[PDB]
Amino acid sequence: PAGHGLRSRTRDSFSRAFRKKGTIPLSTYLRIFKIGDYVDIKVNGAIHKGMPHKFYHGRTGRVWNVTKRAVGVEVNKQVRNKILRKRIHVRIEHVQLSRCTEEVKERMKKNDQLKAEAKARGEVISTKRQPVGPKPGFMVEGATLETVTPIPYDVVNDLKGGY
């Protein structure tokens, strides 16, 4: 409405991948969705029912409801000077389980194990990971050195493959 249809400017967004049209693989319908799961919204152009608005395409949200064929997703949306947690319902064909938190549980388990080991030996440690820092000094074995010099200019080589 108001000068723009629901699917305006979706020629590329809602189109299917090259040589990937037709029947949908069964893995899409065999997935399990539960409350609190993070999902990625990817519109399947062949499924016209339960289609999210184009804005939510390419955005990640959290599952808050589970119906027979669709799943409720809460997606942040910036409107002027605030963020709105807009709740939508989307069919499972248009949604994929997100990997944005795949390493969290593993890291927590390893941190707990390390903390328990440190407590056993009576030491205090920090399990926080750190950004890559400066490397220490080291010795590099001498080898044959190849000299690099600027190339004399030749106009005939200005074209790819030569003039």
Partner: protein, 288 residues
């Protein structure tokens, strides 16, 4: 000349269908509609009653779908029926009924629900549905016909009736059982029982031996060799049903796998051998 159709661009733009569709074995619309489960039921699996008819065998199995692939809860083959006394007509309506009953008994034994749900030991031709018990609901499975045509009197519906009599809850109607009349929207129980007991085969046998004895022999050589007459088919099928009900547990083969497997197919040539053959061919071509 004529322009080439299978051009390079044609192959470049070509999208292959799913492998099971290219082989023409799986209908993915029906498969998807059969397996898709309500998401608010989570990891609850939908078992389906798969029945397939080969040229000389009947395959029946209960399957559940997973990402790694379908999982078989139980299976039953018509080639196992000779252990129960059925040696001929393994691909007819009665064989389908026996296979369905055997699979139902086997799966109920696997789930330890055989005692609670017994069905009707007698075949009968009337529409039947196992009555739910108080302890638990009957095991539920959905029929998976496949690519066959779902006509009235199809063997798949005979297997469905066998499974229903076994004590399995399979959603169904009575419009496709053998004996159902198109003109009158009713099921003829007598005709259904006749088909379940192979009486149509017996009638064909009698007609053939009355009219064309040589064709009767050419058509029922195996029946004659096994010494089964038209009148003895019903009692034989009753005995087969009784034997199936008495002991439905699948037998375990006593054969031992060979220590080494002999190869009977050609192996892919190595890079060196291929290059040697190419060199020989190129030398032969140039030396001309």
């Amino acid at each position: 000349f004529i322009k080439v159709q299978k051009t390079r661009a044609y192959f470049k733009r070509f999208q292959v269908k799913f492998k099971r569709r290219r082989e023409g074995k799986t209908d993915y619309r029906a498969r998807n509609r059969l397996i898709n489960q309500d998401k608010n039921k989570y990891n609850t699996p939908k078992y389906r009653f798969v029945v397939r008819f080969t040229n000389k065998d009947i395959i029946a199995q209960i399957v559940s779908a997973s990402i790694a692939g379908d999982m078989i809860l139980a299976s039953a083959y018509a080639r196992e029926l000779p252990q129960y006394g059925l040696k001929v007509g393994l691909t007819n309506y009665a064989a389908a009924y026996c296979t369905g009953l055997l699979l139902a008994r086997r799966v109920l034994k696997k789930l330890e629900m055989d005692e609670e749900y017994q069905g009707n030991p007698e075949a009968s031709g009337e529409d039947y549905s196992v009555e739910p018990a108080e302890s638990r609901r009957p095991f539920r499975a959905l029929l998976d016909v496949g690519l066959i045509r779902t006509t009235t009197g199809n063997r798949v519906f005979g297997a469905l009736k066998g499974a229903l009599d076994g004590g399995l809850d399979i959603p169904h109607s009575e419009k496709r059982f053998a004996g159902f009349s198109k003109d009158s929207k009713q099921l003829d129980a007598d005709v259904h029982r006749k088909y379940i007991y192979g009486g149509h085969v017996a009638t064909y046998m009698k007609t053939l031996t009355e009219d064309e004895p040589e064709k009767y022999q050419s058509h029922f050589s195996e029946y004659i060799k096994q010494g089964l007459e038209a009148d003895d088919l019903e009692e034989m099928y009753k005995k087969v049903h009784a034997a199936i009900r008495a002991d439905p547990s699948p037998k375990k083969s006593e054969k031992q796998p060979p220590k080494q497997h002999k190869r009977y197919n050609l192996k892919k040539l190595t890079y060196e051998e291929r290059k040697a053959k190419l060199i020989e061919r190129l030398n032969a071509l140039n030396s001309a």
